[PDB]
Amino acid sequence: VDMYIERAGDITWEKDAEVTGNSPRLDVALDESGDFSLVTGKR
Amino acid sequence: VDMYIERAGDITWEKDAEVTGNSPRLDVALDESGDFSLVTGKR
Amino acid sequence: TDGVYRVMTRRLLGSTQVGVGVMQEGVFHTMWHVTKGAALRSGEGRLDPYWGDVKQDLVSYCGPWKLDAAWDGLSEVQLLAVPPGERAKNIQTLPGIFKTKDGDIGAVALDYPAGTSGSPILDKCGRVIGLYGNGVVIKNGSYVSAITQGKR
Amino acid sequence: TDGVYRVMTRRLLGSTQVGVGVMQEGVFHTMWHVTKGAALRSGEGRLDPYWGDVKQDLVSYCGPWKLDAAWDGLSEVQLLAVPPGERAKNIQTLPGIFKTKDGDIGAVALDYPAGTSGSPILDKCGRVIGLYGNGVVIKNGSYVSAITQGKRE
Ligand SMILES: [Cl-]
């Protein structure tokens, strides 16, 4: 494998950043493979 | 010599971005090698 | 050097982003499924995995897991999304929760494509409270990622 | 495929950013001194230079120079700096002017390290009015870059 890392930038909080997304309450299950289920998920 | 390109992002104007830098007024000379002088400059 | 990193792979057509990671205190943090324990090239040479949890989908390079900040359960957080071929962006959101039969875990309803996994999630002080990219796809096709944090 | 790109080089250990470029209308634009006419691997395969000018320090891949926007001579501009190992940043500034015995060119007093050359300078509408990274080091050590723009033909 020829996998590598390259620095993308500093890690900072942004004042006045765009606010998006809801706040869901989800019944989920997590298996031994690290995969969540609902009662692929990996990006 | 083994150069390549990777996409870095969209080209957009940023509303109320950081404003800095002076407004200079410089007499310069540009030679056949593309190098400016004052009367390296390449980054 | 501390900061957020793109996990890339060498290709004939240049490179391809397979994930994202966080460097803090000389330790590189990303998602297990991003690298699958493979060694990583870097400007400082080879980096080797030090700790891994397949179920947590986490992996640590050069040292033990260093990230420890936690979501308070009340406040808004920011995802520092580093998507493939796109510009890094801060997205603020109020997290939801994964209601596991084994406890509760915060979750952000922010949808980003494969290769963004490992992007840091921050608190108002800028500490990484977790990594993005392991979650579920909801019935409407949207993606909800857990705020995955390891044990320090 | 339009956008700003990092120009990288394969190293023994990993990779190193040598410059920046602009993709527009199927043509890749950067500074001559970044690539020196070398071919570029890319998502579209090998890219070969189509037009070059060492004196202007510009080079074009896959087609003739396509960037045509010009600085107003009055208005503020934005540098989309893409520095090595750093996140892309917009910096708004009011350009100065380089005076040549043969004409005038705008110049931005924004200082960014080697490897940022080729970063686009934009107008309010988002068009590349020039590329960053060719200029002079001023007596106080700071860097002033010309707004280098190519003839389009
Ligand atoms: Cl960025």
Numbering used by the authors:
A (entry chain E), B (entry chain A): 49 to 87, 127 to 130
C (entry chain F): 19 to 170
D (entry chain B): 19 to 171
Excerpt from the paper describing this PDB structure:
NS2B-NS3 protease is responsible for all cytoplasmic cleavages including at junctions between NS2A/NS2B, NS2B/NS3, NS3/NS4A and NS4B/NS5 proteins and within the capsid, NS2A and NS4A proteins. Similar to NS3-NS4A protease from hepatitis C virus, the flavivirus NS2B-NS3 protease is essential for the virus replicative cycle, and thus constitutes an ideal target for antiviral drug development.
We observed that the NS2B-NS3 junction was cleaved during overexpression in Escherichia coli and throughout purification steps. We crystallized eZiPro and determined its structure at 1.84 Å resolution. N-terminal residues V49-D58 from the NS2B N-terminal region form a β-strand within the N-terminal lobe of the NS3 protease, while C-terminal residues S71-V87 of NS2B fold into a β-hairpin that inserts into the catalytic site of the protease, and participate in binding the substrate. Remarkably, the NS2B C-terminal tetra-peptide T127-G128-K129-R130 makes specific interactions with both the NS3 protease and the remainder of the NS2B cofactor. Notably, the side chain of R130 extends into the S1 pocket by stacking with Y161 and forming hydrogen bonds with D129 and Y130 from NS3 protease. K129 from NS2B forms hydrogen bonds with S81 and D83 (unique to ZIKV) within the S2 pocket. Overall, the structure of eZiPro captures the post cleavage state of NS2B-NS3 protease.
